[PDB]
């Protein structure tokens, strides 16, 4: 299938997860942050040599809690916003809402407090890859294409300005 190698094209370089265990699950959900982390990694590395440098992200200690920022170039300049994200409890067979708070407010393809909303297929290839995606791909395949349209239509609408400096 096109959407099979599409993903598989995406994902191609990033570590599989393993365990299934979300924040309650002690030693295991101990287990699965080293996963999420030793992905997060390498897709970053991976990122700096594609010259697409895109994301940062940051955990509480309990890596219950995620925020940072991504960036978005769009003819040559460079566009930054602040991205949060709590894990859900029944993770990782349900996928985290990641909020990007400066883009709240009545914008296509977002619900309120600025959840992103993705479309209909995203929601099915993770349900059929439980437990293999973790945090590297929800942004590989969720908050990286968004981008891709989202950001490009503010900036035509004029809701989103670059910031001189």
């Given at each position: 299938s096109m959407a099979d190698e599409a993903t598989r094209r995406v994902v191609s370089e990033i570590p599989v997860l393993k365990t299934n265990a979300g924040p309650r699950d002690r030693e295991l959900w101990v287990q699965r942050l080293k996963e999420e982390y030793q992905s997060l990694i390498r897709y970053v590395e991976?990122?700096?040599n594609a010259?697409?440098?895109?994301?940062?992200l940051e955990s509480n200690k309990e890596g219950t809690r995620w925020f940072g920022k991504c960036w978005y170039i769009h003819d040559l300049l460079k566009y930054?916003?602040?991205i949060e994200f709590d894990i859900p409890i029944t993770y990782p067979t349900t996928?985290?809402?990641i909020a990007v708070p400066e883009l709240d407010g009545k914008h296509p393809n977002m619900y309120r407090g600025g959840k992103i909303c993705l479309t209909d297929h995203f929601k099915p290839l993770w349900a059929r890859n439980v437990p293999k995606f973790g945090l590297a791909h929800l942004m590989a395949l969720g908050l990286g294409p968004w981008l891709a349209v989202?950001?490009?239509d503010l900036i035509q609408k004029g809701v989103i300005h670059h910031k001189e400096k």
């Open positions: 991976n990122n700096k010259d697409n440098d895109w994301f940062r930054e916003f602040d996928a985290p809402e989202e950001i490009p």
